[PDB]
Design a protein around this ligand. Structure first.
Ligand SMILES: C[S@@+](CC[C@H](N)C(=O)[O-])C[C@H]1O[C@@H](n2cnc3c(N)ncnc32)[C@H](O)[C@@H]1O
Ligand SMILES: [Zn+2]
Lengths: 232, 147, 143, 426, 130, 58, 65, 200, 214, 43
């Protein structure tokens, strides 16, 4: 395909000249090799799965950790290249067929990272020496306060959950409610607070959470948004 | 004895084969389940369908249609038992894996598996036709895979 | 779309999440969502550390008493085996079974001990999340 | 915006009384967009004739048909066309009295009553999409379906057979309501249609908006009658630029613009509700008529006949009788195609038309058409006057007037067609 | 095999393409006149499938004639006599089984089978049917 | 790997990997050695149009 | 990056994945027969087929994205 | 049986209560005699278990729900079924008298926390809350500064001065602490040395 | 062992391909009564309708989704009849309905899918992975029980013990309160009427034939 | 799970499980209407 590329650019007049330039390994050869590799898939074989190669520095083949002496193969015909790209990609095969079990699930460091990411607050006796938190109006204010070292990853905070649908719960009745004489009341729960009134309506939920939990939710929401950006 | 020669063989095969299927699906999947290595039954059931696929014609089944000891599919045996009066008789057989292969009509799938010389000798004496279908017998011929 | 968790990601919980994502969005979204959660996991693992030290491992504190118990019984039985009160098969079966019993207890009290008394212990998080080291392997280090 | 109640279609457009296509309320699209509806290159517009879909951009031609809309199955309503009643959004709880009522319908005569029961139940089922969508359905005073008419309108319909069929439909509906909304029904039924007007409205909507298709729900290939909350806003045409199509993997109804057709900004996106039904059938079910209806018929009994093939060629009509179409090669339209399907006609292998006897036949059939027009008390343009100015926009009455007018206008086009055919036969 | 491929296309297709009696006749004819191999088990399978289709397929003259052809070209006379005893009820059944005297002659083969197998009380019935 | 590729149904890659990347000449060897054992491994294909029994080049 | 969502869209469009991929291979080989421009550099016939088909779906993707 | 045209349909989780109402522009007034309970849509009625003295006169009340949330989190089928569902489960309702039956817009509008009626979905029952008042002044105190705390699954009611109100943070912290203290004792008790150890 | 098993299974089922939409089978495998009752149904197709009274709840050749199985187990509809591969009319190929939901999609399995070899692999490769309770004193204190209620025995270890075939209540007089423990029938109580017991000490316990040489 | 050892109870299970029932017990003499064959076979 490098020879065919050198013919396509007319930089070699015959296949022997193309082979001679390939032997000379001049930068032109690597530019045409980058042109050839662009959009051409290859099979990797341990266990046999196909990927888009990208020309990389060094000499040892580089593989993605979740897809991880691998052998390498080029599909030669156009029908084979089509079948490879449309059937044989990891995108097409995220499920193990034996029951339909997701293969690529976060594992090793990432999972324990996510575990710590989602460990969040120290609870109760582990958090206060004796028996007896900021509010953030949106999650980017909380992340900003974390970056500015006003709060730590483990530390409890309140986020205004103005998307006041989709509140998570444990089927637990309110741990406490406060009613003001003027008919506002606050419901306090082990995980969140709701301010609502007999006149007017619910003002806001405030969820008691951590920078870690916020980041876990936000980076998935922003991954969905980043993918669906192309839907525009 | 209870159902006589027109039906007793057919329903005896049916009851044997369904009991066997239930027993094999249980005894096999019970291992995986007790080991916690879960699997869907639809993968086991194709193998058990092959193990219980055949019946054999017994001596009292000697006929010009089927000879004794011949192995025929359960569908073939049921349908010919409905259709013909020609002394049809058969009994279910639990064809083990290594005997479901070497009794798979595409002779290349037999020969390239095991007993290659014996398979080829019989099939050449039988003049057998492998009407090429299925995958193992197609990759040898370098085909497009009938799948 | 997805519910806010406010709860720790167990390996079973993330298996549920990823399966539900594949079933809801198909491959199209989930192959990006999971590939970004990779980077999130790497980031938070790098900001943390899961380093293991000689006193990050954490022998269950009553092990000494339990071993002394199993030791004293064995000594008494060995004494009584010399006296001809106990035959060799009973002594053998004690030597097997009382130490198997102790080893099992020591395992069944390893996880509660971490979760109640050192929740953020490295090998606790390693085994309870399922990253590396089965509970048996952690116990064979610790217990 | 996954909440709220009472969004409505601004009634500034249905204010034609003093004497045109403003955008629909953005919430009308938003309630879909939040629920994975997508409109591509089209806009909902609100005329005094209600909603329509219009192209908001010029769309280039494409080799396959091009998607213009996607509606997800979760927002639809469905009844099985054949006896074993099942609901694939499965709104109705098992053992709900609605299932007993819906079973008491005739398997094939009363599909509209079944759909009306589902529609009403879907207005009662909170946080079903139609709880919000019902505000955008035409109310009982603005629906065109003649099930809401009365004798004051049907006297203006002047079509006794169609009057009789409308009367039978109304009788059937009201008898069903009286039988199944008697005082003994549970409150969770009586609250669906506490009066006859609510039920006859629901039936009129079910009739005017029922799509039907063969579909695949997973493995099950099946016949459904269904309501699709944004494909039912497509207006009828017998020359449609779009068609509905089903995707079973993600259970999407596509609205597809026809392959190889370009379309223009402001063009109405239309579909062929039922192919091959006379205007009286469109009045019976949907409650409208169109003058270019290429399947309409005329009660000719004449032995005068015209050379069919010459009638085609003088108007450059092409194709088989099931297929007749017109091309670029300009008054020729669906009414002339209807004429070719309807006039007493003769044909022979190659034999030419008698230039004299065809003019004689033209004269005879023209005087037949003239006496047919003379059977009405008024001309076409008198009804045009009675529609360019009108007392109160009484929708059923205006629909009956549109019907009569369309028929006369048609027969007029028949006269003009025979005139131009004779002249252009030279 | 090339006929049975179409039959297998039909029998496991949509209802509008399910085999009819003629489809069974043509595939039984294909098997019974095969050049090179024993087809009796296939013909018996096809017959059993036709019986399994009893709600939709009923036999005709040509079906019984082809089956008598099969069960007499191969020595299966105890079943041939039964199919001929059914063919008896159709006028011209023996004309069809004579098949104008080509593809050998199934009627002659049947009469010879009855002769050499001594089934004369069936042979006189075949002669009366002729 | 053959089992995996044919599991994906990705059989043109399987054909490439098993034939022109190195009837195929190895099937020619197979038939020739059986033909040397005095067995005629004979390959036919049947014309769908004409029923003609075309003998393959083997 | 994005092109595989188009692939998935077309996989979702066509009623058989294998028949879809067969039709893509057919379209590419007929393209490379009806046109004999070399068309083999930074853009590839498979991506061209996917692009043209998603453009038929109405989506603003350029030839080989 | 009974019609609902003049009844408040107080929908709880396990049943709907029907409470007769007089006409008022705000629909704000309750009969507290014509009490009925109905399975969620069964249109069948019986008198609920009144467990307390109830006012035999038309009076006006605010209403609020002591419901939990629950994440139904159902299994999802192929047509993009939503990977979450969450719904309010009204286990209990509070009806709070208005002081002097003042209307919501009156300048001196105050909730009369002395008179709270509690409706329980699962015992199908009505009760009058035995609230405790911590405020100095008995019946003649300024009621604008009163704040009601409800606790113990809505079984405990305490009127406290507005200033005192514990912060939500310290409430949750104190509940976590009083839980984890008992869990930690229940764990440490298995050790031999527990009998000779200090809380530390 | 795993490698041999995989080779043999694939060689047996190399020919099962989804060649047809519907073999037209008129029969099904019956299923009736729990996680196994789920897994045996999910992604099958019904061989026959199911009705709950007059309410039709599922129809022939409909897919079993989780909601339908949940309805079935809610309303007790036994005899759920499903088109398993055993129901199919061919042994040399399978039709997509008799296989049901795809191994890797939400819709039916796909015509041409090598579900045979997929099954063979999916069974062979997991082959690589295949391979009395003690009651203990929860508190320090004094054991108390009426030891006349229980039979004397010699334990497997030669220790004397009591063997009990009743619900026995054992008190532990701890330093704070009279804790208690329930001992089930058929159990070896290793302790005695007034023994001092220490926390986590075992208090009760609830072939080959081999030569031992002295 | 096992079918009964007694054949008749095994037939009752065959009915109840619908693995085999009397409606599948049919043959040509009962299918193509060869009502005469009753008079031939048993004599
Ligand atoms: C499928 S419903 C659409 C609902 C309608 N857009 C509305 O505003 O409620 C068809 C209705 O649109 C109108 N309609 C249908 N076909 C039409 C046509 N060809 N020209 C004008 N109006 C038409 C009639 O009032 C008919 O009841
Ligand atoms: Zn099947």
């Amino acid at each position: 395909f490098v020879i065919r590329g050198l013919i396509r650019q007319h930089l070699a007049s015959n296949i022997g000249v193309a082979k001679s330039q390939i032997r000379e390994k001049k930068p032109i050869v690597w530019e045409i090799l980058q042109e050839v590799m662009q959009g051409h898939p290859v099979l990797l074989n341990r266990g046999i799965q196909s990927f888009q190669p990208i020309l990389v520095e060094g000499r040892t083949i580089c593989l993605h950790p979740l897809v991880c002496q691998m052998a390498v193969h080029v599909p030669l015909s156009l029908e084979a290249q089509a079948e490879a790209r449309l059937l044989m990609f990891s995108h097409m095969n995220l499920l193990s067929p034996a029951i339909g079990d997701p293969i690529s699930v976060p594992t090793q460091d990432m999972l324990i990272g996510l575990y710590v990411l989602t460990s969040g607050t120290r609870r109760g006796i582990c958090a206060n020496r004796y028996n007896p938190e900021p509010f953030f109006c949106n999650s980017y204010d909380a992340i900003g306060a974390y970056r500015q070292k006003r709060i730590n990853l483990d530390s409890p905070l309140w986020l205004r959950w103005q998307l006041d649908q989709r509140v998570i719960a444990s089927k637990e009745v309110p741990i406490e409610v406060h009613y003001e004489s003027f008919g506002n009341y606050h419901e306090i729960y082990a995980h969140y607070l709701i301010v609502r009134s007999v006149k007017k309506e619910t003002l806001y939920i405030y969820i008691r959470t951590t920078v870690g939990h916020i980041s876990f939710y936000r980076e998935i929401e922003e991954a969905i948004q980043g993918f669906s950006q192309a839907c525009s | 004895r209870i159902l006589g020669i027109p039906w007793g063989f057919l329903i005896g095969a049916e009851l044997t084969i369904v009991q066997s299927r239930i027993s094999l699906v249980n005894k096999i999947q019970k291992v995986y389940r007790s080991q916690g290595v879960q699997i869907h039954n639809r993968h086991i059931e194709i193998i058990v369908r092959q193990i219980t696929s055949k019946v054999l014609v017994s001596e009292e089944g000697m006929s010009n249609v089927f000879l004794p000891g011949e192995l025929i599919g359960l569908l073939r045996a049921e349908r010919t038992g409905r259709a013909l009066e020609e002394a049809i008789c058969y009994r279910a057989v639990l064809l083990g894996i290594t005997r479901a292969s070497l009794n798979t009509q595409s002779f290349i799938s037999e020969a390239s598996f095991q007993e290659t010389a014996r398979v080829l000798a019989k099939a050449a004496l039988r003049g057998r036709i492998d009407w090429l279908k299925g995958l193992k017998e197609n990759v040898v011929l370098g085909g497009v895979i009938p799948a | 779309n997805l519910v806010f968790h406010n709860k720790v990601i167990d390996g079973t919980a993330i298996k549920r999440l990823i399966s539900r994502l594949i079933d809801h969005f198909g491959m199209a979204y989930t192959s990006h969502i999971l590939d970004q959660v990779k980077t999130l996991g790497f980031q938070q693992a790098t900001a943390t550390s899961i380093s293991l030290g000689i006193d990050d491992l954490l022998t269950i504190p009553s092990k000494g008493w339990l071993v002394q118990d199993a030791e004293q019984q064995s000594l008494i039985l060995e004494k009584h085996h010399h006296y001809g009160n106990v035959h060799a098969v009973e002594k053998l079966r004690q030597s097997i079974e009382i130490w198997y019993a102790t080893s099992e207890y020591l395992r069944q009290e390893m996880n509660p001990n971490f979760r109640m008394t050192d929740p953020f212990n490295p090998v606790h998080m390693m085994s309870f999340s399922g990253a590396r080291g089965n509970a048996s392997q952690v116990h064979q280090l610790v217990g | 915006a996954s909440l709220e109640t009472q969004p409505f279609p601004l009634f500034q457009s249905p204010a034609s009384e003093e004497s045109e296509l403003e955008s629909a309320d953005p919430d009308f699209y938003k309630i879909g967009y939040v629920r994975r509806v997508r409109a591509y290159g089209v806009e909902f517009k609100e005329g005094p004739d209600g909603f329509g879909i219009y192209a908001s951009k010029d769309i280039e031609p494409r080799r396959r048909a091009r998607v213009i809309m996607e509606i997800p199955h979760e927002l639809m309503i469905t009844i099985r066309q054949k006896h074993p009643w099942m609901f694939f959004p499965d709104i109705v709880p098992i053992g709900h009295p609605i299932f007993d009522i819906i079973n008491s319908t005739d398997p094939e005569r009363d599909w509209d009553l079944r759909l009306a029961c589902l529609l009403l139940f879907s207005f009662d089922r909170e946080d079903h999409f139609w709880r919000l969508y019902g505000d955008f359905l035409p109310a009982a005073d603005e629906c065109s379906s003649l099930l809401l008419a009365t004798e004051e309108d049907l006297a203006e319909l002047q079509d006794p057979q169609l009057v009789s069929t409308i009367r039978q439909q109304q009788k059937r509906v009201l008898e069903f309501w009286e039988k199944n909304w008697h005082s003994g029904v549970p409150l969770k039924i009586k609250r669906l249609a506490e009066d006859a007007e609510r039920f006859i409205w629901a039936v009129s909507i079910a009739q005017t908006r029922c799509i039907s298709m063969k579909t695949r729900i997973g493995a099950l290939v099946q016949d459904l009658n269904m309501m699709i909350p944004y494909a039912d806003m497509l207006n009828h045409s017998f020359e449609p630029n779009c068609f509905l199509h089903w995707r079973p993997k993600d259970r999407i109804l596509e609205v597809m613009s026809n392959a190889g057709q370009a379309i223009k900004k402001g063009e109405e996106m239309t579909i062929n509700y039922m192919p091959g039904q006379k205007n009286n059938m469109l009045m019976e079910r949907y409650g409208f008529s169109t003058p270019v209806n290429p399947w309409d018929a005329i009660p000719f009994s004449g032995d005068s006949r015209i050379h069919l093939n010459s009638f085609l060629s003088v108007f450059n009509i092409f194709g088989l009788p099931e297929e007749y179409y017109h091309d670029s090669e300009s008054f020729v339209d669906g009414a002339v195609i209807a004429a070719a399907r309807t006039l007493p006609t003769w044909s022979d292998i190659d034999l030419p038309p008698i230039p004299s006897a065809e003019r004689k036949a033209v004269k005879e059939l023209q005087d037949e058409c003239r006496k047919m027009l003379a059977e009405y008390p008024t001309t076409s343009e008198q009804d045009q006057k009675l529609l360019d100015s009108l007392s109160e926009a009484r929708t059923t009455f205006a629909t009956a007037v549109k019907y009569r007018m369309h028929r006369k206008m048609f027969i007029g086009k028949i006269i003009k067609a025979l005139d131009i055919y004779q002249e252009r036969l030279l | 095999e090339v006929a049975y491929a179409t039959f297998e296309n039909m029998e496991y297709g949509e209802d509008f393409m399910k085999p009819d009696t003629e489809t069974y006749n043509w595939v039984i004819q294909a098997y019974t006149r095969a050049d090179s191999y024993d087809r009796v088990q296939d013909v018996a399978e096809l017959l059993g499938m036709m019986v399994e289709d009893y709600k939709r397929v009923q036999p005709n003259v040509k079906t019984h004639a082809l089956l008598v052809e099969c069960f007499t070209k191969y020595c299966v006379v105890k079943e041939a006599i039964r199919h001929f005893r059914a063919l008896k009820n159709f006028e011209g059944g023996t004309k069809v089984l004579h098949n104008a005297g080509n593809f050998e002659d199934p009627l002659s083969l049947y009469l010879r089978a009855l002769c050499r197998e001594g089934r004369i009380v069936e042979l006189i019935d075949a002669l009366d049917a002729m | 790997e053959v089992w995996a590729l044919e599991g994906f149904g990705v059989a043109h890659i399987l054909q490439e990997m098993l034939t022109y990347k190195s009837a195929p000449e190895s099937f020619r060897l197979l038939v020739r050695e059986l033909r040397s054992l005095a067995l005629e491994l004979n390959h036919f294909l049947v014309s769908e149009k004409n029923f003609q029994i075309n003998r393959k080049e083997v | 990056k994005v092109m595989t969502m188009d692939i998935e869209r077309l996989l979702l469009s066509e009623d058989n994945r294998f028949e879809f991929v067969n039709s893509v291979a057919a379209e590419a080989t007929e393209y490379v027969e009806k046109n004999r421009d070399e068309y083999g550099g930074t853009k590839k016939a498979i991506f061209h087929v996917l692009s043209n088909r998603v453009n038929d779906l109405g989506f603003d993707r350029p030839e080989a994205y | 049986r009974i019609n609902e045209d003049e009844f408040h349909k107080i929908s709880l989780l396990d049943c709907d209560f029907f409470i007769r109402k007089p006409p008022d522009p705000d629909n704000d007034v309750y009969d507290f005699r014509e009490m009925y309970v109905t399975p969620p849509d069964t249109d069948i009625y019986s008198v609920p278990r009144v467990l307390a003295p109830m006012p035999q006169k038309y009076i006006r009340c605010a209403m609020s729900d002591y419901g939990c949330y629950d994440v139904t989190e159902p299994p999802i089928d192929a047509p993009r079924d939503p990977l979450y569902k969450s719904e309010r489960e009204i286990s209990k309702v509070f009806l709070t008298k208005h002081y002097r039956n003042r209307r919501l817009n009156d300048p001196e509008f105050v909730l009369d926390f002395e008179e709270i009626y509690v409706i329980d979905s699962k015992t199908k029952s009505i009760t009058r809350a035995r609230v405790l008042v911590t405020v100095p002044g008995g019946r003649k105190r300024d009621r604008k500064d009163d704040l009601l705390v409800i606790r113990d699954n809505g079984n405990s009611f305490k009127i406290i001065h507005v200033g005192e109100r514990d912060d939500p943070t310290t409430v949750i912290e104190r509940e976590e602490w009083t839980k984890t203290r008992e869990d930690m004792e229940k764990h440490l008790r298995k050790l031999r040395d527990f009998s000779v150890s200090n809380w530390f | 062992d795993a490698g041999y098993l995989t080779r043999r299974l694939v060689e047996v089922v190399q020919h099962i391909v989804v060649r047809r939409t519907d073999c037209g089978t008129i029969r099904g495998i019956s299923v009736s009564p729990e996680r196994i009752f789920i897994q045996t149904l999910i992604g099958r197709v019904l061989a026959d309708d199911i009705y709950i009274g007059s309410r039709c709840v599922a129809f022939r050749n409909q897919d079993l989704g989780i909601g339908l199985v949940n309805r079935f187990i809610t309303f007790g509809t036994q005899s759920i009849s499903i088109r398993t591969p055993f129901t199919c009319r061919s042994t040399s190929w399978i039709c997509r309905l008799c296989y049901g939901r795809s191994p890797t999609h939400g819709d039916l399995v796909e015509l041409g899918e090598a579900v045979g070899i997929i099954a063979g692999q999916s069974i062979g490769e997991p082959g690589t992975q295949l391979t009395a309770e003690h009651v203990r004193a929860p508190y320090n204190g004094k054991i108390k029980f009426n030891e006349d209620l229980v039979h004397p025995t010699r334990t497997r270890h030669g220790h004397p013990a009591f063997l009990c075939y009743i619900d026995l209540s054992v008190i532990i007089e701890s330093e704070d309160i009279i804790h208690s423990v329930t001992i089930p029938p058929k159990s070896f109580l290793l302790v005695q009427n007034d023994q001092y017991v220490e926390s986590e000490q075992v208090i009760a316990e609830i072939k080959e034939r081999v030569r031992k040489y002295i | 799970d096992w079918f009964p050892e007694e054949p008749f109870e095994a037939f009752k299970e065959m009915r109840e499980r619908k693995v085999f029932d009397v409606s599948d017990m049919y043959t040509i003499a009962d299918v193509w209407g060869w009502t005469w064959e009753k008079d031939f076979k048993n004599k």
